[PDB]
């Protein structure tokens, strides 16, 4: 009765779990799964380019539209900023005032000196200069600020209207713009230009079938609502996870020419990893508690410890222990020598 514990687990030697263990050595075999992965399609993210404003204003117009062609580069939109309206002048209002304010000064520092001094007004005139300078300095970072980011679009006279243009070739994917409508945030994005020719089919796996994928497979590839089945080769590959899904992305092109292929739509694919020469435990053997996972490795007869193992691939009942757990060890059957009840 019935466990004993150092860490390690102990049976007497008097206990009834002494009739109910079994175990047997861990058989390295030859393994040769084929597994099954989640997908979506995904544009060639670039390839695809969510057009963004440089700067906030009135849509004057929309060329190009939903479904129209496009050729980089191509006008997509113009823009009429109102904003770099004020700007422009409000900084050459500035400017005026300083230059004005400034030769206001120095027709008052003449007088105090040749000939007769006057009066104190030069005081209001260098409070009225400093500060026109100062402002016009305001307004000349308040340019600087938006030509910097509206300079590359401009056009030579107009309004102050930008011309955002294509800078790849395509179809016009996504619309949701209005003429006239002011346009405030960014990205926001005004319309999307893609080439959907080809697309990636991006499917996502997970650590259990991650020493099975290879580039270079080998892929069959069923979508919905398409019945036929259809052939890939991944081409990319691995390489880290995403922390919150714990997925790693393996993605393989496929031609669209048709292009029945739309990015988003759902498939599975279905892969048969390389034979190579695996560990494998029936179910019963391993064990979960939380985010793990183990079996129990017999000693010394009677004496197990626990062992973190992990795991995977698996059908029907063989486990695939990809470490570890190595070839020997006498590994339970099992089962439930991790409560005492
Ligand atoms: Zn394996």
Same mark, same amino acid.
């Given at each position: 009765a019935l466990r004993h514990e150092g860490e390690r687990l102990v049976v007497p030697a008097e206990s009834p779990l002494r009739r109910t263990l079994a175990v047997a050595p861990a058989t390295r075999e030859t393994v040769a799964a084929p597994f099954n992965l989640p997908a979506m399609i995904? !544009?060639?993210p670039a390839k695809l380019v969510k057009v963004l404003p440089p700067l906030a204003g009135r849509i004057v117009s929309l060329n190009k539209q939903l479904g129209d062609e496009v050729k980089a580069g191509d006008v997509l939109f113009t823009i009429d900023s109102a904003d770099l309206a004020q700007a422009n002048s409000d900084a050459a209002k500035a400017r005026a005032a300083m230059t004005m304010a400034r030769r206001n000064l120095?027709?008052?520092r003449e007088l105090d000196k040749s000939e007769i001094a006057a009066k104190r007004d030069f005081e209001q005139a260098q409070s009225d200069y400093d500060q026109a300078a100062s402002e016009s300095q305001r307004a000349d970072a308040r340019l600087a600020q938006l030509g910097a980011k509206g300079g590359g679009t401009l056009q030579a006279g107009g $309004?102050? &209207?930008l011309a955002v243009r294509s800078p &790849?070739?395509?179809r016009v994917v996504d619309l949701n713009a !209005?003429? $006239?409508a002011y346009w405030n945030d960014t990205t926001a994005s005004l319309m999307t230009v893609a080439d959907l020719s080809h697309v990636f089919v991006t499917a996502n796996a997970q650590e259990k079938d991650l020493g099975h994928v290879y580039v270079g497979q080998s !892929?069959?590839?069923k979508f919905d609502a398409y019945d036929d089945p259809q052939?890939?080769?991944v081409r990319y590959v691995g390489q880290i996870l995403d922390a919150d899904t714990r997925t790693t992305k393996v993605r393989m092109v496929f031609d669209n020419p048709d292009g029945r292929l739309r990015p988003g739509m759902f498939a599975q694919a279905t892969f048969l990893s390389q034979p190579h020469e695996g560990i494998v435990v029936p179910m019963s053997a391993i064990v979960q508690?939380?985010?793990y996972t183990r079996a129990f490795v017999e000693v010394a007869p009677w004496q197990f410890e626990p062992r973190v193992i992990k795991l995977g691939a698996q059908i029907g009942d063989r486990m695939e222990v990809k470490s570890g757990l190595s070839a020997g060890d006498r590994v339970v059957v099992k089962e439930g020598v991790l409560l005492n009840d």
């Open positions: 995904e !544009a060639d120095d027709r008052q $309004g102050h &209207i &790849i070739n395509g !209005a003429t $006239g !892929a069959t590839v052939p890939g080769k508690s939380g985010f």
